[PDB]
Design an enzyme around this catalytic site. Structure first.
Site, PDB file in Angstrom:
ATOM      1  N   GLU B  72       1.474  -0.268   1.993  1.00 26.06           N
ATOM      2  CA  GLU B  72       0.053  -0.361   2.309  1.00 26.06           C
ATOM      3  C   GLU B  72      -0.208  -0.494   3.800  1.00 26.06           C
ATOM      4  O   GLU B  72      -1.133   0.118   4.335  1.00 26.06           O
ATOM      5  CB  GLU B  72      -0.585  -1.535   1.559  1.00 26.06           C
ATOM      6  N   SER B  92     -10.157 -13.277 -10.174  1.00 24.84           N
ATOM      7  CA  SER B  92     -11.252 -13.806 -10.979  1.00 24.84           C
ATOM      8  C   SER B  92     -10.663 -13.973 -12.369  1.00 24.84           C
ATOM      9  O   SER B  92     -10.877 -13.142 -13.249  1.00 24.84           O
ATOM     10  CB  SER B  92     -12.429 -12.822 -11.004  1.00 24.84           C
ATOM     11  N   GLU B 110       4.240   0.703  15.612  1.00 28.60           N
ATOM     12  CA  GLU B 110       3.519   1.839  15.074  1.00 28.60           C
ATOM     13  C   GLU B 110       4.544   2.874  14.628  1.00 28.60           C
ATOM     14  O   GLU B 110       5.427   3.243  15.395  1.00 28.60           O
ATOM     15  CB  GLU B 110       2.596   2.421  16.142  1.00 28.60           C
ATOM     16  N   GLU B 112       3.395   5.680  12.487  1.00 25.50           N
ATOM     17  CA  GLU B 112       2.655   6.908  12.216  1.00 25.50           C
ATOM     18  C   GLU B 112       1.425   6.988  13.114  1.00 25.50           C
ATOM     19  O   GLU B 112       1.469   7.574  14.195  1.00 25.50           O
ATOM     20  CB  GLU B 112       2.215   6.947  10.750  1.00 25.50           C
TER      21      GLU B 112
HETATM   22 MG   LIG Z   1      -4.413   1.011  -4.038  1.00 27.11          MG
END
Ligand SMILES: [Mg+2]
Ligand SMILES: Nc1ncnc2c1ncn2[C@@H]1O[C@H](COP(=O)(O)O)[C@@H](O)[C@H]1O
Ligand SMILES: Nc1ncnc2c1ncn2[C@@H]1O[C@H](COP(=O)(O)O)[C@@H](O)[C@H]1O
Ligand SMILES: [Mg+2]
Lengths: 152, 152
Positions: B72, B92, B110, B112
């Site tokens: 991510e 939740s 870095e 990319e």
């Molecule tokens: Mg996702």
């Protein structure tokens, strides 16, 4: 936006490709007393366990965040106090619109399912790091908020 | 538990009276550099606006929280760094089982759709208090975590 289901605390809609769960807004109350934070635990069928949370609930028709915060504190812990709005957040904006308004409660007075768990935030944190207890977003927010602004 | 719907990122089930939304677990990455926190913004159809979040996403089949955290960070910001597990929380627990694992990223390099928003946590907080920006749970957790343990 089209709807595939309309239930008690949520609706399941489809907006093109996006699956959206509409949910009533909620409130949470951070309360500290003599170095102990006011947590609460209850059976949560959705997760099969009882995470450590703080007094919280859905805003009923007619009330605003503040009034809901007051009610939840009273119904779940039998207490009341001076409430100050802190901030809010969307629990998971990627699929649901549930928004939670967080309040700080002070000068708690007793005025009067759910387990009331008074615990030092440092202790909740350590227990969690050990895999002893799980956190709900409200519980973690309470713990972090304390460590950041209530150690004074 | 019975199912009323099975979709892309969620299933809608019924467990007696309880309406349960099964959701894939997720990760979030808190990254600080020169006093600025790494936030990200993207269009969120579920809420009609773009709240301030931190790099985050769903754990794909085969990967664990750590590997997902790495992916991510790379896909959304083009960066990589040293990751340390911090804690987790159920977004939740009252209706969904989505669990979010939070990581700290350091020594960013870095290597990319999504807007990269470098911003001082104090500034995100002030802007939010002014009604200028909304927070997702990940963004608020990042802000609070910073104020609590990263001011050193
Ligand atoms: Mg996702
Ligand atoms: N609410 C949604 N319903 C169905 N698919 C979605 C939804 N939100 C995101 N997606 C897709 O699933 C992936 C999940 O990534 P993310 O939104 O960052 O958690 C994205 O690449 C989207 O294309
Ligand atoms: N997942 C659920 N599906 C349908 N009804 C629920 C669900 N969770 C809680 N309720 C009911 O709705 C009310 C919401 O309160 P709370 O669970 O504290 O947010 C409770 O008094 C429950 O009886
Ligand atoms: Mg409720």
């Amino acid at each position: 936006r089209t709807y595939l289901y309309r239930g008690r605390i949520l609706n399941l809609a489809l907006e093109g490709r996006y699956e959206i769960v509409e949910h009533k807004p909620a409130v949470a109350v951070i309360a500290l007393r003599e170095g102990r934070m006011l947590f609460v635990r209850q059976m949560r069928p959705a997760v099969g366990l009882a995470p450590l949370e703080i007094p919280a609930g859905l805003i009923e028709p007619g009330e605003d965040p503040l009034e809901a915060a007051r009610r939840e504190l009273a119904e779940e812990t039998g207490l009341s106090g001076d409430l100050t709005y802190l901030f809010s957040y969307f629990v998971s904006p990627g699929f649901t619109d549930e928004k939670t308004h967080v309040f700080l409660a002070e000068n708690l007075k007793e005025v009067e399912a759910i387990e009331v768990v008074w615990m030092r935030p440092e202790e909740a944190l350590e227990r969690h790091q050990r895999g002893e207890v799980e956190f709900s977003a409200t519980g973690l927010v309470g713990v972090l908020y304390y460590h950041a602004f209530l150690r004074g």
